[PDB]
């Protein structure tokens, strides 16, 4: 926390940045709201941020959704490898499926989610203005999560193109439900670690 005081303070002055890259050291609840207070600047002009790994928790997820209330700049956030649950989910959702949410890569890569966030996680898929990609790999979503995201992704509205999702532990009745979708929706392209397509 020292040391992120210096970072804050320069990025103060710092004039142009499109792009902050965090990932992999750890922030405190407090950097976090240091660097809440940097994005909500008018002269930010961030359009990726990167806090994948980098210990955040749920309560970290609503202080970022704020922080990105008034933000028109970000276009990409990942927040993979962080312990965020199902109700840290929740948080960024409420934020994303508003009308003047710009963003448009969100990664959300092994962050402990499950099945109970895939309603809110639809609700984003239907309602979202921006959202275009969105990796979900290495959560526990299982057959009953990735029901709720493709009646979601069925929505003429959706705007993603790119999903990133486990199919592996799926059903057979799951997978086939996913090729059709991908048969009707040729504009979406479900991937995954296994299936890099």
Not at 17 to 33: C, F, I, Q, R, T
Not at 90 to 113: D, F, I, T, Y
Not at 116 to 127: E, I
Not at 149 to 170: F, M, N, S
Request: net charge positive; with cysteine; charged share 25%.
């Amino acid at each position: 926390d020292a040391y992120w005081q210096i970072l804050f303070s320069v990025l103060k002055v710092t004039r142009n940045l499109k792009e902050l890259d965090l990932s992999g050291n750890s922030l405190s609840h407090s950097a976090v709201k240091s660097l809440c207070k940097t994005l909500r600047r008018p002269r930010c002009l961030l359009e990726t941020l990167r806090l994948a790994g980098c210990g955040l928790t749920a309560e970290d997820c609503k202080d970022l959704a704020f922080g990105l209330r008034a933000n028109q700049t970000l276009t990409e956030l990942d927040l993979s490898f962080n312990v965020l649950t199902d109700a840290g989910a929740k948080h960024l959702c409420q934020r994303l499926r508003q009308p003047s949410c710009k963003l448009q890569r969100l990664q959300l890569v092994s962050c402990g989610l499950t099945s109970d966030c895939c309603q809110d996680l639809a609700s984003v898929l239907s309602a979202s203005p921006s959202l275009k990609e969105l990796d979900l790999q290495q959560n526990n979503l299982d057959d009953v999560g990735v029901r709720l995201l493709c009646e979601g992704l069925r929505h003429p509205a959706c705007k993603l193109i790119r999903l990133g999702l486990d199919q592996t532990t799926l059903s057979d009745e799951m997978r086939q439900e996913l090729r059709a979708l991908e048969q009707e929706k040729p504009q979406l392209l479900i991937f995954s670690r296994r299936k890099p397509s």
